[PDB]
Amino acid sequence: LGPRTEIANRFQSFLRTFVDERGAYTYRDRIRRMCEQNMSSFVVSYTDLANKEHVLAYFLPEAPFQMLEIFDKVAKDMVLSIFPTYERVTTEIHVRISELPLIEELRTFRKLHLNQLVRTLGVVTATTGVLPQLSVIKYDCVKCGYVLGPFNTEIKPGSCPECQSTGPFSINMEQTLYRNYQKITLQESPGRIPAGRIPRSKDVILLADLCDQCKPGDELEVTGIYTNNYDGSLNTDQGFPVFATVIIANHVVVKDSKQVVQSLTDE
Amino acid sequence: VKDEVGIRAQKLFQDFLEEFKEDGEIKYTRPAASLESPDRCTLEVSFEDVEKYDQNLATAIIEEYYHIYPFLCQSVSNYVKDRIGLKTQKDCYVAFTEVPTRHKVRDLTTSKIGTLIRISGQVVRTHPVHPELVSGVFMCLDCQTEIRNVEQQFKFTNPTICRNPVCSNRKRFMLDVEKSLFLDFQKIRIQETQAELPRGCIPRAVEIILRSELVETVQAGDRYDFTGTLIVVPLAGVGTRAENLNYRMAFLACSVQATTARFGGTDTAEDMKKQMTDAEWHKIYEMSKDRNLYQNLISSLFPSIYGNDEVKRGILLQQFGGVAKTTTEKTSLRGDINVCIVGDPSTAKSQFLKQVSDFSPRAIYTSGKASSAAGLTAAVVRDEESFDFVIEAGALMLADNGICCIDEFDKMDQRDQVAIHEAMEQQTISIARAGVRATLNARTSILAAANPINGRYDRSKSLQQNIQLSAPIMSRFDLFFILVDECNEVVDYAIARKIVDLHSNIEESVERAYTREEVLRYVTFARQFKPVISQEAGHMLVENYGHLRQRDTGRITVRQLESMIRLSEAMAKLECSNRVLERHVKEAFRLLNKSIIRVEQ
DNA sequence: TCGATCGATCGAT
DNA sequence: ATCGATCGATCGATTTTTTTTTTTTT
Numbered sequence: 001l002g003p004r005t006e007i008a009n010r011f012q013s014f015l016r017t018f019v020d021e022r023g024a025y026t027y028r029d030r031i032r033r034m035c036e037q038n039m040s041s042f043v044v045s046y047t048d049l050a051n052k053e054h055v056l057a058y059f060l061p062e063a064p065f066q067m068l069e070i071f072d073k074v075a076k077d078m079v080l081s082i083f084p085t086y087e088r089v090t091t092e093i094h095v096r097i098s099e100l101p102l103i104e105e106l107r108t109f110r111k112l113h114l115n116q117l118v119r120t121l122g123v124v125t126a127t128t129g130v131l132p133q134l135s136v137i138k139y140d141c142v143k144c145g146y147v148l149g150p151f152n153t154e155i156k157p158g159s160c161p162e163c164q165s166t167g168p169f170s171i172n173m174e175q176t177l178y179r180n181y182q183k184i185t186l187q188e189s190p191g192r193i194p195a196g197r198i199p200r201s202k203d204v205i206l207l208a209d210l211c212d213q214c215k216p217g218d219e220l221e222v223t224g225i226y227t228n229n230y231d232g233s234l235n236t237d238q239g240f241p242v243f244a245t246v247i248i249a250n251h252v253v254v255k256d257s258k259q260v261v262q263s264l265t266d267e
Numbered sequence: 268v269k270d271e272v273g274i275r276a277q278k279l280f281q282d283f284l285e286e287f288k289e290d291g292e293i294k295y296t297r298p299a300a301s302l303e304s305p306d307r308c309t310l311e312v313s314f315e316d317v318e319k320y321d322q323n324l325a326t327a328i329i330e331e332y333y334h335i336y337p338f339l340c341q342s343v344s345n346y347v348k349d350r351i352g353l354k355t356q357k358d359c360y361v362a363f364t365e366v367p368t369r370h371k372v373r374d375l376t377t378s379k380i381g382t383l384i385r386i387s388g389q390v391v392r393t394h395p396v397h398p399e400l401v402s403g404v405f406m407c408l409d410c411q412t413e414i415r416n417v418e419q420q421f422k423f424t425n426p427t428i429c430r431n432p433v434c435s436n437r438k439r440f441m442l443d444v445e446k447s448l449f450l451d452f453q454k455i456r457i458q459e460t461q462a463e464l465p466r467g468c469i470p471r472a473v474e475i476i477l478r479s480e481l482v483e484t485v486q487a488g489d490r491y492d493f494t495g496t497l498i499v500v501p502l503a504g505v506g507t508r509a510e511n512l513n514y515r516m517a518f519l520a521c522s523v524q525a526t527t528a529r530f531g532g533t534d535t536a537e538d539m540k541k542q543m544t545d546a547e548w549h550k551i552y553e554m555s556k557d558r559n560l561y562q563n564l565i566s567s568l569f570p571s572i573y574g575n576d577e578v579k580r581g582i583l584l585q586q587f588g589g590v591a592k593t594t595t596e597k598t599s600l601r602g603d604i605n606v607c608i609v610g611d612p613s614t615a616k617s618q619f620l621k622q623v624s625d626f627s628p629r630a631i632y633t634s635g636k637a638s639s640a641a642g643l644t645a646a647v648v649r650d651e652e653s654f655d656f657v658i659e660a661g662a663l664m665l666a667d668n669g670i671c672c673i674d675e676f677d678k679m680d681q682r683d684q685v686a687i688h689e690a691m692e693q694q695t696i697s698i699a700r701a702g703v704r705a706t707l708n709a710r711t712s713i714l715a716a717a718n719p720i721n722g723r724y725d726r727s728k729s730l731q732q733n734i735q736l737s738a739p740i741m742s743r744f745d746l747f748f749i750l751v752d753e754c755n756e757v758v759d760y761a762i763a764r765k766i767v768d769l770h771s772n773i774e775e776s777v778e779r780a781y782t783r784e785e786v787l788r789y790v791t792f793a794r795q796f797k798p799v800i801s802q803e804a805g806h807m808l809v810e811n812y813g814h815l816r817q818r819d820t821g822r823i824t825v826r827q828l829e830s831m832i833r834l835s836e837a838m839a840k841l842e843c844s845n846r847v848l849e850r851h852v853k854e855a856f857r858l859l860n861k862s863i864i865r866v867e868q
Numbered sequence: 869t870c871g872a873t874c875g876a877t878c879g880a881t
Numbered sequence: 882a883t884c885g886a887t888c889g890a891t892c893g894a895t896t897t898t899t900t901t902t903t904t905t906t907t
């Protein structure tokens with residue numbers, strides 16, 4: 001498209017046009033800094049985005065999924081083009097955000113905060129362990145013995161090597177890509193309570209690049225995005241439909257910082 | 268259809284309030300004027316005004332409510348559209364009020380539906396927000412899925428046939444979470460009323476519901492005045508069954524008056540820093556310039572009392588300010604400070620403080636030996652309700668930015684008290700054995716209520732042996748001011764002739780000079796000032812302290828000093844002035860020396 | 869024992 | 882003679898909870 005191409009192109013004319021710190025801007029070199037160490041967790045500044053092009057605040061909330069995807073395509077087509085040897089280790093990228101002009105306390109968010117940009121914090125409690133997931137749709141045809149091909153929703157087209165036939169199928173335990181997974185339980189601090197009552201909480205999902213980072217009993221900072229479980233069994237109802245809530249993780253900052261930590265000025 | 272009469276009626280209601288509603292003035296557009304920017308979708312209405320102008324739509328409104336209810340949202344829309352460039356985003360929240368009739372749980376039958384009757388009770392076991400994508404889009408799968416329909420029904424139903432085509436009616440299109448309708452509520456239970464206290468039966472429980480803007484402005488421990496919009500609610504019921512089913516009872520309500528839990532902070536209708544924070548300049552100007560204001564203030568809260576006149580000049584200390592200065596990240600700097608009382612048996616030790624809780628807000632008093640050792644900590648639980656260990660509260664910590672004094676300071680176990688040994692200065696408390704690395708904060712002052720050892724003041728022993736407890740605590744209490752008992756008839760006859768003007772039912776008290784409300788508002792104005800120190804006393808307090816300890820050259824040191832400069836910066840807050848002066852110094856020095864020589868044998 | 873599946877069948881057109 | 886609607890034979894899909902023995906804290 002004409003305008004709907006300009007996003008990645010403005011990222012391209014961003015990471016070698018916007019400058020701070022007396023030349024040799026970070027993201028000219030931060031990306032190769034990270035491709036060296038084989039990390040694949042590049043991070044963005046929002047304030048730098050406001051310094052260069054303030055357009056990217058209204059264009060975002062209408063579907064930030066697509067914003068993040070159109071982000072990651074740029075990191076791919078940059079890195080794997082300029083480091084073509086790289087295409088061995090992970091071959092997938094996404095980016096992070098760590099600058100938001102707002103800290104939304106718990107017990108403050110409602111349906112108005114649906115599917116858009118967030119910041120929130122709190123405390124961890126008990127949650128699950130570490131498990132992997134699926135990533136791709138591939139089956140094995142069972143009438144004719146072929147594979148249907150590569151393709152929260154099912155697809156199942158009639159087109160396939162078996163003369164576009166074989167509604168039936170079966171599945172292997174290999175040749176399909178996987179994805180690490182973990183859950184969390186976010187509870188608010190027992191300092192900033194309404195002074196003596198039960199607290200409130202939500203669940204949160206984090207994804208494969210972000211695991212074995214959190215822990216029970218810790219301090220926290222997350223951007224997150226507000227989810228919507230699309231149906232907890234709509235039917236004859238209670239005095240409420242049985243609906244639920246999660247936030248999906250984009251980027252964490254921990255507050256303890258128990259490692260060698262700060263990024264480096266040029267001088 | 269039924270409700271077209273209500274349509275026309277609220278139409279002409281609109282058409283009247285379209286003009287004035289009250290004496291060429293309007294009270295039901297300016298809420299809409301404030302609404303006009305964010306469009307939050309609420310406008311409550313008085314039911315009395317229905318009795319004023321529309322001439323008894325109550326029996327038009329008060330029985331067939333639920334079927335008329337949704338037509339009034341369209342009424343609201345037809346209102347808001349008349350003047351603003353309008354989309355159909357407009358919605359109907361309601362917080363009905365001004366209705367005379369206020370009934371209870373027991374006058375409930377199958378004939379009570381679609382009404383607006385009013386009820387109270389108490390709040391228990393409350394429950395959270397719980398969103399609802401009430402709406403969406405749903406039809407066949409060919410192309411024609413844009414469905415702004417009524418799929419918001421209680422029982423929810425995917426199945427819709429079509430709009431444009433003739434297609435499948437069991438294969439749905441997928442759902443819409445993007446450009447649809449979502450809303451917010453919560454859910455609680457409520458117990459039998461304490462304003463209606465019968466015998467016999469249990470506290471019959473009611474289910475009860477609130478809308479979005481009603482949400483999270485209720486709370487545990489409150490008595491209410493609700494709507495009465497009882498509903499049809501979408502084993503053991505072995506009656507007859509039909510079809511061309513066994514229900515329970517439920518209820519909702521859409522109006523709240525969460526009263527008996529309301530003060531409102533500080534906002535002579537005149538000009539000031541803010542709207543009404545100190546609009547009484549006309550008199551506060553005088554209340555900050557009078558020269559006898561100290562004594563006129565002293566005797567302005569204890570007319571029903573007579574004793575010493577030394578804590579009637581001090582204890583304003585506790586309610587008075589501290590510092591609230593602008594510094595770096597060195598550490599917390601503290602503002603308020605302890606006080607102590609000891610005395611002989613019942614010289615009105617307790618009536619000083621039984622009332623002071625009723626005096627200022629946020630500062631509730633009781634004892635902790637009223638309960639377990641759960642004064643400091645919450646109730647230590649070791650059985651499974653949610654995750655087997657829940658201790659995030661207490662009672663002492665329920666006084667944040669306010670005080671919660673005690674009585675019988677002496678006979679309390681040395682667990683809460685040894686915890687107090689730290690909890691008052693480094694005002695951050697911690698525990699283990701059930702703590703998610705427990706990090707709390709109390710902030711506030713205290714008042715003590717000791718009682719001697721034998722119940723007398725025989726000067727045979729030092730004060731620290733007059734009480735004979737553990738020691739270091741008796742410094743951070745920066746002023747004691749003990750009340751003494753003697754045996755003299757003049758005093759006691761003066762007391763009895765206080766009772767002469769306690770029950771002589773006309774003029775059963777003495778005249779006064781300063782009323783309470785003006786006093787309290789002056790006090791709550793006096794804090795927000797950002798005080799200043801630039802005074803030679805600020806230069807020359809070193810010799811005052813050096814002289815203090817020239818007297819102490821014959822316990823000791825600089826905790827008392829911290830107190831000193833805060834006592835006196837408070838007594839200059841009392842002068843409604845910044846810019847510390849060197850006299851509040853001398854008074855504070857005198858108070859210090861009264862305290863220590865009072866401690867002296 | 870309950871439910872949709874699918875294939876057949878009977879009037880309309 | 883073409884085609885849609887209704888009937889009906891054909892197919893597969895559901896049916897696990899109340900005491901105890903250690904454990905931390907008053």
Ligand SMILES: Nc1ncnc2c1ncn2[C@@H]1O[C@H](COP(=O)(O)OP(=O)(O)O)[C@@H](O)[C@H]1O
Pocket residue numbers: 571572573574612613614615616617618762
């Ligand atoms: N100067 C005084 N002014 C008013 N009341 C006084 C004074 N001196 C003594 N009293 C009386 O002494 C009583 C003290 O009772 P109190 O100390 O509250 O009992 P307890 O010791 O159980 O708390 C008060 O009720 C009050 O009537």
